[PDB]
Design a protein around this nucleic acid. Structure first.
Ligand SMILES: [Mg+2]
Ligand SMILES: [Mg+2]
Ligand SMILES: [Mg+2]
Ligand SMILES: [Mg+2]
Ligand SMILES: [Mg+2]
Ligand SMILES: [Mg+2]
Ligand SMILES: [Mg+2]
Ligand SMILES: [Mg+2]
Ligand SMILES: [Mg+2]
Ligand SMILES: [Mg+2]
Lengths: 62, 216, 225, 52, 128, 19, 124, 109
RNA sequence: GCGCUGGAGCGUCGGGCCCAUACCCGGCCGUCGCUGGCAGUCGGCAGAGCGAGAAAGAGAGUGGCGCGGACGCUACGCCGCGACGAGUAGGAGGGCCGCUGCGGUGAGCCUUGAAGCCUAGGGCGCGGGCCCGGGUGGAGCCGCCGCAGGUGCAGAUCUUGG
């Protein structure tokens, strides 16, 4: 066999939002395309924060 | 242009030449060979002229079609394969047929056909063997040969000649060619003592007879 | 018009074709030079031994700097200290092989995992066969078969390693950038030894297989490769 | 797609693609071995003739 | 002539016999339907040698030839004639299955419609 | 010569040499 | 719009039908009759459709206009084509390609028209 | 007008002490009892001939009750001339200690 | 165990051979990772690429007939590479696994025969199970999208009945 431990062999990070909001999914599709077809990591960070849940994106005050 | 010429590099092994790139450059003499720099037809109709299009658009389209396969290189058709024979099979040798209806009989071998099969024939007066094709693998070759380098087989018989047509009937040309080749083979084999009887006899395995121990 | 775009792209393709051909000539001549260096290295030791013998003295050969290590024992029942070094040697599966350079740290590590490994001094032919047949490369933490020189070049080009011959050259005659090349090389998955092991549990000195098989490791590789 | 790895020790053109100098090495060794073989045959024939 | 499919692959099945549930021959109350045992000392659960094999993931057939009939098509249940026009384009890959609840008179119309549309029917002459 | 940036002129000259 | 309606229709429309590891769409203007964003015939501003004619011969081609997006009564224009197979295929091919009217599914329309044409002929 | 196949005895399957693999069969060809003599029989066609209840088609002749299971000879097995064979279908255990024909038309001489 | 004594015993050993789910290559399934690639189907409103060892444009401007082009893309979709696959108690995820009823939906099925039941019948799915064929039945029944539960038995000296 192999001397490999599978405690952390699976990443826990998200890949899609856990909400069925169609407008959010459409924005997810747009930034998915931008992230995979642009060299700027800003879209990737926006895509990650789009995937994040409600509590992970607290309402920023004015 | 110029007359095509053979390769200037003798083959050392398969895929490797005997002369290096610079040596072959000299042999080619490239130092002094430098260089530098349909669909419509008009047809009269009695009207005017019609522009007829060959290779028209297809009348039908299937519901779906398979994608085109990838491209390979070494998968040549059987018509242009290279054919090889065992080292124990030479023109004028004696063969033992094991598979066909003439199994276990000793036959005289003539030559290798263009289809890769062995053109074999025994004296029909001896063992009832016509001019028949046979496979190299399915034939045992023995260490008894006759020198038929002075005979001439007809050149009008090939794989197409021996190809099956479609009750079977014997054509007159088959008998004529069989007699023509027998008249050259039978007198030659009769020079060797006790050879006609050996060809008439058949091959069989008795008790205690083992092919690995016995040598033919 | 497109008459200038077509000729421009033809020139660009011709330019990169010439660059590729120049690279092919480069690696060809580098391989020739490495062959000459191999001949010089092989003859030098014999010549120095001969000149010492004819004078009556002795010539101690240079102590080997490169070794090939094979994991011959399984996962089950391994001390935690032993298995940690096995992980550091990248020997996880049984019959996994790797090249390790020799030093004070390496020799002690081989000693502490002596019962579970078989290590020796491979020669040029062994390195050639292992790299060409069982030699893969870790490309983007994957396992890609080394079927082309561009795979090695894209990852080891900055270390003046552009072709497999350069890789073999550094592996045999350890250079400055040996660690990067060895870490690039995936651990070798060698088959079971044809003909069988004489004895797995015991040391090679006492007739077994484990331990320091100095120059006899080539015999093991010839049948495990 | 996945490329089927062919053994350079078995295949010739695969070995040449990885290392072009193998072609010249394999040409030289064949010519050297053939030349050495015919030299030994000639030497053995000369020795047999002298002994005879 | 029977309506041949677009492609006829060589369907290879890793296992043909069904997975018989443990001790289904011994008792009548136990049905042949498989159930994974949770016994502490269960002989089959610890997959002892020469025991009942368990339905592992590795028995999954190839995706290219999955759910494929021996004729080379895929079953599709059809109730009325209106559903046949759905499979009009999927002619060379998918066949049509007539529901058990379809009456004889409607089944005749479905069969003749599929004959016009060159759609294979598994049971074209079920009731007649 | 094989270096892309610094071998461009050398590759250009050998290309002209072939012509 | 189009994607906005698709995100609702993709798994909720009455035309949707799932069984036997397969899913389709029985909307009146769906080429290939399968549920996809490319071939949906209700969520696109411009749509083509190939259907058999009222008589047992010919093919009716349905096109969606530009103005009456919210007027379903006048949104579609139906043209009947009754001629040879080659001419019908050329007519549909020109109708889509040279008008640039949803050129993504011109081949699918041609396949459907050919399938309808071969189905209309008497069966041996 | 006689036998054209070597005689072989179906000794058993390719088996361990406690396990057997039915896809490979062990054959004992009469006459050969060593590895240096089993080289000739490699690659030959081995056929097991048996009869049945009802008739079956026979190529080049009238249908009859004889059936066979064709197979090839893969490689040697042990120092005593025993050989390994693989058949299109695994040989039934009824054939243990029964004659199997080893043909000669897969010739290599 | 049978048996074994120029061993089939004892000590030192040499070849050869035998086979595990172990190792090497290959096929298939699934998981994980590259949080990899695909909106570029940009077509007489056109020009077919971004696999290539080397950070960045097949970038633009100022002067010296024939009317043609396969699939794709349910983006919750498709496709490409690698590594891995044991499991009690226990945890999590996917169920186009199963039952009952409710809201929608199938111009759904049905006395030209529904549920139920039997079947040496044809199959599919790894599996939960499911779809057709044949016989009895005479009046109801199901698929998809969501909702709800008194929702799955081999045991409990389980309850009732046989
Ligand atoms: Mg494993
Ligand atoms: Mg975890
Ligand atoms: Mg142990
Ligand atoms: Mg062996
Ligand atoms: Mg226990
Ligand atoms: Mg597991
Ligand atoms: Mg209830
Ligand atoms: Mg029963
Ligand atoms: Mg009533
Ligand atoms: Mg019970």
């Amino acid at each position: 066999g192999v001397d490999i431990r599978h405690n952390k062999d699976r990443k826990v990070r998200r890949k899609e939002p856990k909400s069925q909001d169609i407008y959010l999914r459409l924005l997810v599709k747009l930034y998915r395309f931008l992230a995979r077809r642009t060299n700027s990591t800003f879209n990737q960070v926006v895509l990650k924060r789009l995937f994040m849940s409600r509590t992970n994106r607290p309402p920023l005050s004015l | 242009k110029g007359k095509p010429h053979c390769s200037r590099n003798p083959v050392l092994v398969r895929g490797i030449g005997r002369y290096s790139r610079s040596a072959m450059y000299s042999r080619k003499a490239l130092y002094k060979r430098k260089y530098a720099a349909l669909a419509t037809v008009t047809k009269p109709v009695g009207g005017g002229t019609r522009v007829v299009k060959l290779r028209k658009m297809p009348r039908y389209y299937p519901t779906e079609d398979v994608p085109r396969k990838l491209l390979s290189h070494g998968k040549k058709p059987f018509s242009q394969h290279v054919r090889k024979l065992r080292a124990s099979i030479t023109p004028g040798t004696i063969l033992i047929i094991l598979t066909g209806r003439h199994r276990g009989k000793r036959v005289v071998f003539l030559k290798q056909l263009s289809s890769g099969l062995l053109l074999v024939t025994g004296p029909l007066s001896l063992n009832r063997v016509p001019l028949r094709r046979t496979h190299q693998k399915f034939v045992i070759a023995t260490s008894t040969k006759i020198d038929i380098s002075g005979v001439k087989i007809p050149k009008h018989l090939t794989d197409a000649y021996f190809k099956k047509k479609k009750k079977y009937e014997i054509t007159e040309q088959r008998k004529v060619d069989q007699k023509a080749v027998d008249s050259q083979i039978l007198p030659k084999i009769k020079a060797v003592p006790q050879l006609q009887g050996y060809l008439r006899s058949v091959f069989a395995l008795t008790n205690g007879v083992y092919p690995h121990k016995l040598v033919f | 018009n497109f008459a200038e775009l077509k000729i421009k792209r033809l020139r660009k393709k011709f330019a990169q074709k010439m660059l590729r051909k120049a690279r092919r000539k480069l690696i060809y001549e580098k391989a020739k030079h490495y062959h000459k260096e191999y001949r010089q290295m092989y003859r030098t030791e014999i010549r120095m031994a001969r000149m010492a013998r004819k004078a009556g003295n002795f010539y101690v050969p240079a102590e080997p700097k490169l070794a090939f290590v094979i994991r011959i024992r399984g996962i089950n029942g391994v001390s935690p200290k032993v298995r940690k070094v096995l992980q550091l040697l990248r020997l996880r599966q049984i019959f996994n092989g790797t090249f390790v350079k020799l030093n004070k740290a390496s020799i002690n590590m081989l000693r502490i995992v002596e019962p579970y490994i078989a290590w020796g001094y491979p020669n040029l032919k062994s390195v050639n066969e292992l790299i060409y047949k069982r030699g893969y490369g870790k490309i983007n933490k994957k396992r890609i078969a080394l079927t082309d020189n561009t795979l090695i070049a894209r990852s080891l080009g900055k270390y003046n390693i552009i072709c497999m011959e350069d890789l073999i050259h550094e592996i045999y005659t350890v250079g400055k950038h040996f660690k990067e090349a060895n870490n690039f090389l995936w651990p070798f998955k060698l088959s079971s030894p044809r003909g069988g092991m004489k004895k797995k549990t015991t040391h090679f000195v006492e007739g077994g297989d484990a331990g320091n098989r100095e120059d006899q490791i080539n015999r093991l590789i010839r049948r495990m490769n | 797609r996945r490329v089927l790895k062919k053994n350079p020790l078995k295949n010739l053109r695969i070995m040449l693609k990885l290392n072009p100098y193998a072609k010249t090495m394999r040409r030289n060794t064949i010519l050297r071995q053939a030349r050495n073989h015919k030299l030994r045959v000639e030497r053995a024939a000369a020795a047999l003739a002298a002994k005879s | 002539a029977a309506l041949r499919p677009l492609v006829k692959p060589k369907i290879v099945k890793k296992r043909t016999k069904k997975f018989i549930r443990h001790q289904s021959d011994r008792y009548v109350k136990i049905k042949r339907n498989w159930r994974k045992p949770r016994g502490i000392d269960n002989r089959v659960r610890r997959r002892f040698k020469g025991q009942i094999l368990m339905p592992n993931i590795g028995y999954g057939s190839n995706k290219k030839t999955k759910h494929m009939l021996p004729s080379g098509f895929r079953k599709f249940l059809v109730h009325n004639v209106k559903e046949l026009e759905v499979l009009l384009m999927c002619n060379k890959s998918y066949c049509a299955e007539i529901a058990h609840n379809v009456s004889s008179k409607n089944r005749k119309a479905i069969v003749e419609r599929a004959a016009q549309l060159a759609i294979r029917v598994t049971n074209p002459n079920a009731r007649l | 010569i094989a270096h892309p940036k610094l071998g461009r002129r050398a590759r250009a000259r050998i290309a002209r040499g072939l012509r | 719009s189009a994607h906005l309606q698709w995100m609702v229709v993709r798994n909720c429309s009455s035309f949707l039908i799932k069984r036997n590891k397969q899913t389709y769409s029985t909307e009146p203007n769906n080429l290939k009759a399968r549920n996809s964003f490319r071939y949906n015939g209700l969520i696109h501003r411009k749509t083509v459709g190939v259907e058999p004619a009222a008589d047992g011969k010919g093919v009716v081609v349905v096109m969606k206009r530009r103005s009456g997006q919210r007027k379903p009564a006048t949104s579609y224009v139906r043209t009947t084509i009754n001629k040879n197979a080659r001419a019908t295929l050329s007519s549909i091919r020109h109708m889509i390609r040279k008008n640039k009217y949803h050129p993504d599914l011109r081949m699918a329309a041609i396949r459907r028209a050919s399938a309808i044409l071969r189905s209309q002929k008497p069966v041996m | 007008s006689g036998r054209l196949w070597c005689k072989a005895i179906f000794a058993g399957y390719k088996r361990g002490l406690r396990n057997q693999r039915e896809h490979t069969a062990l054959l004992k060809i009469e006459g050969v009892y060593a590895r240096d003599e089993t080289e000739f029989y490699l690659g030959k066609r081995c056929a097991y001939v048996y009869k049945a209840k009802n008739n079956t088609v026979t190529p080049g002749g009238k249908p009859n009750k004889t059936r066979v299971i064709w197979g090839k000879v893969t490689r040697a097995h042990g120092n005593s001339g025993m050989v390994r064979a693989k058949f299109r279908s695994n040989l039934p255990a009824k054939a243990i200690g029964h004659r199997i024909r080893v043909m000669l038309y897969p010739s290599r001489i």
